[PDB]
Design a protein around this ligand. Structure first.
Ligand SMILES: Cc1nc(OCc2nc(-c3ccccc3)cn2C)c2ncn(C)c2n1
Ligand SMILES: [Mg+2]
Ligand SMILES: [Zn+2]
Length: 313
């Protein structure tokens, strides 16, 4: 009970900032997550022993893929920590509990391939889950790990609080299917502008948590430029492997995934910032004003990709 995680001074300070990078020391990432749960949620949200066992089972179930790996899990949870800490009073006790766990679990057992690739391959997961294929898998893997002996971090919740938190997690993880983000953000855009947005309406809160999940998931575009740029290499290492596997099925991949079209990456990043990232953080900032630093960092990174295209880097 009296056992805090403490971080070295630089991390204790920088972890509070949206643009924090969790570092290359994998052994510190569990501690960083527990620290974040303790500050976000409280020192008795979870039994430390069960939480430590849950974290290590989650870690084991992330694969050694270039991008959709344990580092991404913890990175996405940190962005959620920063959103929750800057919006203290807007979220319930259950939501704070559920959303850091959701973020840690959101890409469990990811193979480095898109929903499209699984469907074109005719992977068994594409028969079991016809839409949001990997995301329904990720939720399935989260429930599996929660049911291991000694891994039920929610055991101290009442029956209906348990049902509510697993429902928060399920929706939060499904919302990371980027195919669903575009319509979710359009509806939030409409609701905010006509003034119908009501955070006491559960269907509206679901939508806002969905958008928070997209914001945390895309948060590589909200880091300092050297982090954004080096993370983009890991992102494209997966896309280009998927592209190779598309070519093995006799399907020309989209250019994003074709390593033969590396030269078009900077123009492809502009499209991504303009069509996905900037609109994501703009609507998030309209709904949750203290998340503005994410939008500001995203715009700075857009300007850096604009400089790459102008051959100034
Ligand atoms: C940082 C980042 N970038 C992404 O896509 C960039 C992207 N490159 C292209 C492209 C590249 C080369 C040639 C032609 C087109 C298109 N587009 C959308 C992401 N997609 C999902 N996530 C999480 C992403 N995060
Ligand atoms: Mg995912
Ligand atoms: Zn993700």
């Amino acid at each position: 009970g009296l056992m805090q995680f403490t971080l070295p001074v630089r991390l204790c300070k920088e972890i509070e900032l949206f643009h924090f990078d969790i570092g290359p020391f994998e052994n510190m990432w569990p501690g960083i997550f527990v620290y974040m749960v303790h500050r976000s949620c409280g020192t008795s949200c979870f039994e430390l022993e069960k939480l430590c066992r849950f974290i290590m089972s989650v870690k084991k179930n992330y694969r050694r893929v270039p991008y959709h790996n344990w580092k991404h899990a913890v990175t996405v949870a940190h962005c959620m920590y920063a959103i929750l800490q800057n919006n203290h009073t807007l979220f319930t006790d259950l939501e704070r509990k559920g959303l850091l766990i959701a973020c840690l679990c959101h890409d469990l057992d990811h193979r480095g391939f898109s929903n499209s690739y699984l469907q074109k391959f005719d992977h068994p997961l594409a028969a079991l889950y016809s839409t949001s294929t990997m995301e329904q898998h990720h939720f399935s893997q989260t429930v599996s790990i929660l049911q291991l002996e000694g891994h039920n971090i929610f055991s101290t919740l009442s029956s209906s609080e348990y049902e509510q938190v697993l429902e928060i997690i399920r929706k939060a993880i499904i919302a990371t299917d980027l195919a669903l983000y575009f319509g979710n953000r359009k509806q939030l855009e409409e609701m905010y502008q006509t003034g119908s947005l009501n955070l006491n309406n559960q269907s509206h809160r679901d939508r806002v948590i969905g958008l928070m999940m997209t914001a945390c998931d895309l948060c590589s575009v909200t880091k300092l430029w050297p982090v954004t740029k080096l993370t983009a290499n890991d992102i494209y290492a997966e896309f280009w492997a998927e592209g190779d596997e598309m070519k093995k099925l006799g399907i020309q991949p989209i250019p994003m995934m074709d390593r033969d079209k590396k030269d078009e990456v900077p123009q492809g990043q502009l499209g991504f910032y303009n069509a996905v990232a900037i609109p994501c953080y703009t609507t998030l900032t309209q709904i949750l004003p203290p998340t503005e630093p994410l939008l500001k960092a995203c715009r700075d990174n857009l300007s850096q990709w604009e400089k790459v295209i102008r051959g100034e880097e």
